[PDB]
């Protein structure tokens, strides 16, 4: 049977989030990017709502909760993109939302296409490894908790215990399917290495974001208010490497 924390994680997953994308026009660069940012705004709200129901998270110092969301939001979004792409279209298109699904044809602009190829690595890996829902849900919590400030968190003890609890839960999720301690251990290595490797992937998205944000008026790309604040609050600092990514492996 499914362990209870994993069932709970299933229960607190967000409902379907639409981009509000007007698929009557053809997209220019600016309209496509504006629509993705609009979806991003809706997804950021969803992430904060999700965190309020995530066992353990609400008990961290509020400053730590805000910090962790501000550090991890891009990571959580691209990881979720990967999941939806894996689930709905077998990793072969990028399933941003049910009203915003991009195939290669719709990826005209050079830099955005390159960004998409980077993002595509996640669903490709989900397909290759045959990641389960139970594994995904635990890994997703670990991503929220995968980067801390250089000086640590105010609730560092609580945070460490929470992170340990979800590591143990990933081990249970793996154990649902991987039988044998070697197969299970090898799988744990694989899934945690994927998370380690996400730090490098997300750096590329961070840079793209800040570039687009700084150039937003010139590119005619709208950045809604909540996303603008998360970007302004932490992205330059994160990009400068003044944070501590946590790694499972050396
Ligand atoms: C939505 C969504 N799903 O996965 C990802 C990644 C996103 C996402 C994440 C961040 C942002 C912020 N704007 S941006 O960084 O210029 C950008 C745009 C536009 N599209 N994407 C994929 C990015 Cl990153 C917009 C969309």
Residue nearest to atom 15 of ligand 1 (CA): 209
The tokens of 166 are what?
A: 């979800």
Distance separating alpha carbons of residues 8 and 5, to the nearest angstrom: 5
Residue 185 alpha carbon to ligand 1 centre in Å:
34
Q: How was this structure determined?
A: X-ray
Rounded CA-CA distance 243/150 in Å is 5
Task: Check pocket membership of 74 for ligand 1, CB cut-off 6 A.
Answer: yes
**Distance from the CA of 158 to the center of ligand 1, in angstroms?**
31
- E strand or H helix that includes residue 158: helix 156-175
Which residues contact residue 220 at a Cβ distance below 8 angstroms, ignoring those fewer than 6 apart?
30, 34
Host H or E run for residue 216 = helix 216-219
Ligand 1 mean position, distance from CA 184 (Å): 34
**What resolution in angstroms, rounded to 1 decimal?**
1.8
Which CATH superfamily, name and number, covers 1-250?
Retinoid X Receptor (1.10.565.10)
Give the 3-state secondary structure of residue 179.
Answer: coil
Here the tokens at position 132 are 């389960």
Question: Comparing C-alpha atoms, which of 248, 17, 66, 43 is closest to residue 139?
Answer: 248
């Amino acid at each position: 049977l499914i362990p209870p924390l994993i069932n709970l994680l299933m229960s607190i997953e967000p409902d379907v989030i639409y981009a509000g994308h007007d698929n009557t026009k053809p997209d220019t660069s600016s309209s496509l990017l504006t629509s993705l940012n609009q979806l991003g705004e809706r997804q950021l709200l969803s992430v904060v709502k999700w965190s309020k129901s995530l066992p353990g998270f609400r008990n961290l110092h509020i400053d730590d909760q805000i910090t962790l969301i501000q550090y991890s939001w891009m990571s959580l979004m691209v990881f979720g993109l990967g999941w939806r792409s894996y689930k709905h279209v077998s990793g072969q298109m990028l399933y941003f939302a049910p009203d915003l699904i991009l195939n290669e044809q719709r990826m005209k602009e050079s830099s955005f296409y390159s960004l998409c190829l980077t993002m595509w690595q996640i669903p490709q890996e989900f397909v290759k490894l045959q990641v389960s829902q139970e594994e995904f849900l635990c890994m997703k919590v670990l991503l929220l908790l995968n980067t801390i400030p250089l000086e640590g968190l105010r609730s560092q003890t609580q945070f460490e215990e929470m992170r340990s609890s979800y590591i143990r839960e990933l081990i249970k999720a793996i154990g649902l399917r991987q039988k044998g301690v070697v197969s299970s251990s090898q799988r744990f290595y694989q899934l945690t290495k994927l998370l380690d490797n996400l730090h490098d992937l997300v750096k590329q998205l961070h840079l793209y974001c800040l570039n687009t944000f700084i150039q937003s008026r010139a590119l005619s790309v709208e950045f809604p208010e909540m996303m603008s604040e998360v970007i302004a609050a932490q992205l330059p600092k994160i990009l400068a490497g003044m944070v501590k990514p946590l790694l499972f492996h050396k």
